[PDB]
Amino acid sequence: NKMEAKIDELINNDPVWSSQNESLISKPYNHILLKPGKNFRLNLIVQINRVMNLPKDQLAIVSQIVELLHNSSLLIDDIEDNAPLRRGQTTSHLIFGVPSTINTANYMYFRAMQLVSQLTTKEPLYHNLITIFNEELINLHRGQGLDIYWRDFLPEIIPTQEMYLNMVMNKTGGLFRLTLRLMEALSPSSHHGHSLVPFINLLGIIYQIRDDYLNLKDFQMSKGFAEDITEGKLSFPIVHALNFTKTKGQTEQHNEILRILLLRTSDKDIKLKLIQILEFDTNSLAYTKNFINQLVNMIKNDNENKYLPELLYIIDHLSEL
Amino acid sequence: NKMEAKIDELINNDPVWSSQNESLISKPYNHILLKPGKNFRLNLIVQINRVMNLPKDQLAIVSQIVELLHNSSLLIDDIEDNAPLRRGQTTSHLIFGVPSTINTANYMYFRAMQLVSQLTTKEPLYHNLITIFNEELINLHRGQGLDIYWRDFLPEIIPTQEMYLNMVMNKTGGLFRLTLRLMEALSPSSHSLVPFINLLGIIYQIRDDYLNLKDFQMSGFAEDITEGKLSFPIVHALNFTKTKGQTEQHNEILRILLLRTSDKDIKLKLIQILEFDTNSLAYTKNFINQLVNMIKNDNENKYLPELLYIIDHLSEL
Numbered sequence A: 001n002k003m004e005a006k007i008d009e010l011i012n013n014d015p016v017w018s019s020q021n022e023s024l025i026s027k028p029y030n031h032i033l034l035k036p037g038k039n040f041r042l043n044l045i046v047q048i049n050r051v052m053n054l055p056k057d058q059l060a061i062v063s064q065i066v067e068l069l070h071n072s073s074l075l076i077d078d079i080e081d082n083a084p085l086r087r088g089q090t091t092s093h094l095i096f097g098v099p100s101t102i103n104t105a106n107y108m109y110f111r112a113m114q115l116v117s118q119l120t121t122k123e124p125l126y127h128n129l130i131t132i133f134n135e136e137l138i139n140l141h142r143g144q145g146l147d148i149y150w151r152d153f154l155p156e157i158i159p160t161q162e163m164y165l166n167m168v169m170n171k172t173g174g175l176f177r178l179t180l181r182l183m184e185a186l187s188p189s190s191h192h193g194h195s196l197v198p199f200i201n202l203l204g205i206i207y208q209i210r211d212d213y214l215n216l217k218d219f220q221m222s223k224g225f226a227e228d229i230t231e232g233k234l235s236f237p238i239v240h241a242l243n244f245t246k247t248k249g250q251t252e253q254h255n256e257i258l259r260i261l262l263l264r265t266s267d268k269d270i271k272l273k274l275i276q277i278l279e280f281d282t283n284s285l286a287y288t289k290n291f292i293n294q295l296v297n298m299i300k301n302d303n304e305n306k307y308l309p310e311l312l313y314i315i316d317h318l319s320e321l
Numbered sequence B: 001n002k003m004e005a006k007i008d009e010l011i012n013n014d015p016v017w018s019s020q021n022e023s024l025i026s027k028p029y030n031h032i033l034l035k036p037g038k039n040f041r042l043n044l045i046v047q048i049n050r051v052m053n054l055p056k057d058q059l060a061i062v063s064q065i066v067e068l069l070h071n072s073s074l075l076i077d078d079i080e081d082n083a084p085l086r087r088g089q090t091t092s093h094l095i096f097g098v099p100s101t102i103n104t105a106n107y108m109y110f111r112a113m114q115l116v117s118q119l120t121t122k123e124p125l126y127h128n129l130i131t132i133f134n135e136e137l138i139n140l141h142r143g144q145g146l147d148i149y150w151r152d153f154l155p156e157i158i159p160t161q162e163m164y165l166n167m168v169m170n171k172t173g174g175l176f177r178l179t180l181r182l183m184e185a186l187s188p189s190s191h192s193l194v195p196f197i198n199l200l201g202i203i204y205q206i207r208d209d210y211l212n213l214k215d216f217q218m219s220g221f222a223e224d225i226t227e228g229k230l231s232f233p234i235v236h237a238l239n240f241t242k243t244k245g246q247t248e249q250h251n252e253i254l255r256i257l258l259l260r261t262s263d264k265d266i267k268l269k270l271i272q273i274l275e276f277d278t279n280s281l282a283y284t285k286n287f288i289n290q291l292v293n294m295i296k297n298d299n300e301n302k303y304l305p306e307l308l309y310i311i312d313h314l315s316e317l
């Protein structure tokens, strides 16, 4: 009867979980926290709040949700890309193992979800906030799924520039839109002008493309290691080169771009060969730089504020988010 | 001018997503569906519905939620245990790759979350439903995290039976409870079945752990040994050897688990320690029978509200 008594108690209570247990499974997450970036994201949220006027406490919870989603996304991204370093340091999966890191990142997606409850007690607003959360986590995973598919099954699908931009709207725009949409739903301010969603989609596009561009340009210049080549990613410049070489009939160059991506190599000279093919042969680096400038000018020349509601500064430090 | 026009259209619309895109992202998921198991789960849900009485379209959605979470959690589990097989079939990550399979399984957790908002339009109840989903997903991940931590940090921590049980309550009980709590919250009818479903969860996992070794003893690849899992019979063996001072046997068990071996002969060596030195396989068989009897001898219906047939077939949930 003593075992029966014991089982009886176990099953009539909530599952036992200790603060010691909590710390053990938080290791992969605690490790990525040590990296900087938190204040730059906080800074963009703060600037956007000059329009939305959420009270300090509410804004802090939006910020916590964003940090959990963002950091958990990176933990997963690094396992998905086989990345050995992030912000200059060893990637969590290489320390704690892939199993713990997947589970912990996934665990934090649900802690983020739980925080949404803390934003309001109003039932109609709550429903809306969780919908926004749900929609953008679905968008996020769709774009990421496509990015991974193209890369890992290359050359099955060679994306065009239009496909790439749609993938980024889902993958990168997800977190930017999730944050803005939560703020717009919670805003006490009557009408603070048109929605900023178009503006935030544009920031996400500039962000990803610049990210892609700098990963190669920094290596060309010195700084980095063009780890995107090692990963075989269909980045903005790679997408332009692949489509450029096809439409120009440069058969050998097109096949060599593909061969190098498929090697998943860490040879610096081989990565530099490809980078210089994009520099001199397909003019993909210059095309990309100009594309970025054009995107940034869409905001810098937005005199009638159809996009815009400090923000210029953020744009120049977008790589630091 | 035209570049800008195109960017304007892009940022002013919802992100573009086609059914062809949906199909590429779904492949790792469609693959595990080829696996049977659905019929058995639906039955348990149908049987529990004789007590809950949810209309059938609502019950269909609950069933859809269970299938997404369960199948997705299995896709992730195989990656976490590095399993090559699932029901005699190649696991998805070995076909579609670890990256696509992780993203697709996580995507499906959110497709499941979205189905929840379709269970009702009543706002108070909707909130309760999402809270249930959230809580149990949190419990599920805590339990999985502890299970993995023990295995990957062995031999830093050797769990006790009580620790193993709390882990199971989180890990395995999570989905059983999530399903039942949703069904009880929606019942249009007038004692809770959670204790019973928790007990089903514990029987489920201990029997799963038991058959993994017992199927191999009688022929089963005993993959749990290769993975180095702190399974119920191994927890019993490690603590029995510790307790009895059997220092070398204690260390030989750890050594074999730490080898991550596929060698049949070495895996049998582990099973002979369990069968001849600690009698852990027998002890486990007895433990499961005692849990099952709590239900068999529940004449007052303290736990209960066919279920017995399901319990002896629980091994295919």
Ligand SMILES: CCCCCCCCCCOc1cc(-c2cc(F)cc(F)c2)c[n+](CC(P(=O)(O)O)P(=O)(O)O)c1
Binding pocket: A041, A042, A044, A045, A066, A070, A072, A073, A074, A076, A077, A080, A081, A139, A140, A141, A142, A143, A144, A171, A172, A173, A174, A175, A176, A179, A207, A211, A321
């Ligand atoms: C506070 C206001 C919002 C700030 C959001 C800042 C980041 C949003 C844009 C980047 O989001 C992602 C999503 C994701 C991501 C998205 C998912 F949906 C899943 C996932 F696992 C990762 C990954 N990454 C990693 C990058 P990288 O390794 O180059 O720094 P990349 O490999 O995607 O280019 C970035």
Ligand SMILES: CCCCCCCCCCOc1cc(-c2cc(F)cc(F)c2)c[n+](CC(P(=O)(O)O)P(=O)(O)O)c1
Binding pocket: B041, B044, B045, B048, B066, B070, B073, B074, B076, B077, B139, B140, B141, B142, B143, B144, B171, B172, B174, B175, B176, B179, B180, B208, B317
């Ligand atoms: C009333 C009907 C309710 C739903 C019935 C089914 C409930 C789930 C039963 C299985 O629970 C799990 C959770 C999980 C699981 C739980 C998590 F929290 C995360 C995860 F990734 C997997 C995994 N597994 C896989 C097993 P195995 O590989 O032996 O088939 P095991 O590895 O637990 O032994 C099973």
